Paper text:
The electron density maps clearly indicated the presence of an imidazol side chain rather than a guanidinum group at amino acid position 470, proving the success of the introduced amino acid substitution. In addition, comparison of structure of hProlArg470His to previously reported structure of hProl using Root Mean Square Deviation of Cα positions approach shows rather small structural differences mainly concentrated around poorly ordered C-termini. The only noticeable difference was the mutated residue. In hProl, Arg470 was located close to the active site and it formed hydrogen bond/ salt bridges with 3 residues: Thr289, Glu452 and Glu453. Glu452 is part of the active site and it participates in catalysis by coordinating both manganese ions. In case of hProlArg470His, substitution of Arg by His resulted in lesser number of salt bridges. His470 forms interacted only with Thr289 and Glu453. When comparing hProlR470H structures to hProl slightly higher B-factors of the His atoms than for the Arg atoms can be observed. This effect is more pronounced in the substrate-free structure. Based on our analysis we can classify the hProlArg470His variant of human [name] as “structurally silent” and assume that loss of function of this particular mutant can arise from flexibilization of the active site.
Residue numbers in the entry:
A (entry chain A): 6 to 484
B (entry chain B): 6 to 488
Amino acid sequence: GPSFWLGNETLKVPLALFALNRQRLCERLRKNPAVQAGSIVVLQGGEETQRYCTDTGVLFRQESFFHWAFGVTEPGCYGVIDVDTGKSTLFVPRLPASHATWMGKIHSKEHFKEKYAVDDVQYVDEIASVLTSQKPSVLLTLRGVNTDSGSVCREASFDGISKFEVNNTILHPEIVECRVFKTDMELEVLRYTNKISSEAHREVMKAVKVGMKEYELESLFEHYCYSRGGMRHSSYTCICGSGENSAVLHYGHAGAPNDRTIQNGDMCLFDMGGEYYCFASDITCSFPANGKFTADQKAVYEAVLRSSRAVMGAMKPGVWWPDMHRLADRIHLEELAHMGILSGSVDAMVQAHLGAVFMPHGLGHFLGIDVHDVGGYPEGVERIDEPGLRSLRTARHLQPGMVLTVEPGIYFIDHLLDEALADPARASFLNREVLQRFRGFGGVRIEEDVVVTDSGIELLTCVPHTVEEIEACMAGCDK
Amino acid sequence: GPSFWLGNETLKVPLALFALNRQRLCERLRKNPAVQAGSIVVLQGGEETQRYCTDTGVLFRQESFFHWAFGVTEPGCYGVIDVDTGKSTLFVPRLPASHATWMGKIHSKEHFKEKYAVDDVQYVDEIASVLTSQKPSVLLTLRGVNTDSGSVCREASFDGISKFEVNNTILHPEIVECRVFKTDMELEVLRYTNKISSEAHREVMKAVKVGMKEYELESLFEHYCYSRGGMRHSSYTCICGSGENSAVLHYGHAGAPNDRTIQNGDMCLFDMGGEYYCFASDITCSFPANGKFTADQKAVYEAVLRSSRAVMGAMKPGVWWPDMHRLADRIHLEELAHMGILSGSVDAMVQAHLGAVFMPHGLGHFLGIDVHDVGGYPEGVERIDEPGLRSLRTARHLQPGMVLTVEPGIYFIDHLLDEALADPARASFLNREVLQRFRGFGGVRIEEDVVVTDSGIELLTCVPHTVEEIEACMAGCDKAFTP
Ligand SMILES: [Mn+2]
Ligand SMILES: [Mn+2]
Ligand SMILES: [Mn+2]
Ligand SMILES: [Mn+2]
């Protein structure tokens, strides 16, 4: 069948990928005791937007649920699925013949059916009539709470929908659960997005020079991903933190727009991931700006490399993800004690939650069409109310087909360090004379993307992540 | 005073630029007979957004009016200006100390006062109290209709605003009019945005190779503008049309995303413009994919170059912009007849609106903080209901300080050509025997940005736009080389 493709060496993504998702959703919905016969899933795609009140067009990126079901790149569409048969109907906007002048060629409905391999194509202005003809019991629309944003999903609406019986509770948890488990076709896309972004990270590491602005590497990374990978979008705003900014978790946004000059002796923490056809990648490389780890930098780096490798080696079906976060905490504390920053019983440090002083974020998260992918906290899965652990984006047990980031880090964040130093329960573990040397160190994060298999994980990321690989890469060495 | 700056070779933009805008707005409002004493301008900045229902953050770009007045890059702010004194107060979000964990240093209000050179800085949640203490007569908020989008500007609102007298009619036309006329400090930025985008266009022309995807040049252009110009944004989505796509005026959107392979013999029409500190640039370069104009390509290009040169030579204060559009139409029709594509009386062709078949868009538009800048159709300036002219984004007379695109073009759009061939009023002018040769030709546009001066225009753009410069550039000649 047909495939999405941007030419050159970019990946061909079969449109069958989305037909399988539609089928998987129907199978799950048929098992749901509350789903009536003759139900129709109704999803609304994203619409074209502009900057505020201007006519400056914003580059359109499809809504993630709609993309998962249909893979449609055009704005203004709807898509419905007959639950009982799996029959898919795409609704495209009716463009007046006069629009050839400005937007391009006016494609027939037949063109879109062939392009997307759906069962039928109708015009958006006919959606009520078309749906009325099928005499559905109820329309299943999308409404739920994204557990990372707190936002409520946009439920489909169209002119005349009030004449139908609409259920907006059943769909969200089912289609979320389908997204948690990636098909082999989806994994192929995630292998590709990791390949391109890994190559881009390698190019950025080769190019970093003392005296450059952080954003020079952001530009380079995105240029590689687009020109070489066909990735017009990034999965998230590039985080190009150097020096003290490598300790700033929320760095690179408009308020801190990657505008610092890289200085000799700085650590760099570059967290960047290209997006291909609305599929994410999420990779972090930390390294010395001048290509040579100091002893202090090497010690901090290898502590995170130890926890990274320990987590990946332990991951397999049945593992509780919060246990992996605790494993990384314990290893960080062991290594920070070895370094002399900490002293005392590591068991006692764990009881005091000292790990979270150095890694306040979650160990990792589901990844997919969204970089922080859906389904981390379905009903019955509770958030853990402890420092560090409460920031985990899922408290689920691992299962095959899940895709997770593994991104332990250690950071020296003055606000957390000072709070711990004022707490007698934690101050005792800290050796100020050594810690002072690491004030302003910044931080180290090592992030990989992995798939849970039947027996362990598959590593998708391929970047230089050992000290030897990093220093060799940055000195212009081959291989 | 302080300056916005992204290091390296990027432009230092004094924050005094925005102080001047605030002062100019206050002077205009003080002259306004309907503005009450003790009035306060209240603008609401843009807020942080995400993709749909996800937590995927969208890179924040400031709202244009708010940027014009204050130059603030942070989301979540408000800004007020006391009309009578000019006193400026920036309101910034109150971040709880616990956000350092993720945010680093949480900047003090003093930091923002020094950063932006405003008279006072307060927290957003105190705006109601702060304004109550100043005992304003009226709050002047922003509401009006953008004449390019049809959208209504977002009026400032905050909890407690109903306790104040609010006027939402006076401000919009005044602040729009202030934006129409660019200050010397603003021109320095628009000169810079044109400089960077011109260099990027040159790099793209040097790098274009038959067999590349259009988007490879889009990526290259944006990479140059950001890495070398500090332009994190483009002024608009890049239009990288090759072959038949050069005839597609709004090409490159998600539905047609610059994904065609450039083939030998194609014309390329690349309309790309970097944005620096929310200031626009807007440039189009047309050129042969293989670096050598054919006779047909050369003829069409020079026809558009003739109309561009004539318009720029004629532009000066007092000139009616629609007259410039008609001038370009007439020159296009004359040259297309000289080519053999058209035959007959050009006077007859003009009366028939034949120009619009070949240039269906407007000749050019105001440019500024927005690429299609505000103020083209203030009250009492009417859109002209004719082909081509109805697409003009202003029907105003030129005055010094205005910034305009000059972007004539000729395109071979089958839809329009066939319409003309089915119209007895127009069909006779077309010579199919020659016209057939130009079906699928694509199109040529030559777009530059200019400033209206006291007596004419200043050229902001510096790209290869003659046939000789273009072939020279694509053959790797240096920018200094004079062909
Ligand atoms: Mn990341
Ligand atoms: Mn991540
Ligand atoms: Mn343009
Ligand atoms: Mn333009």
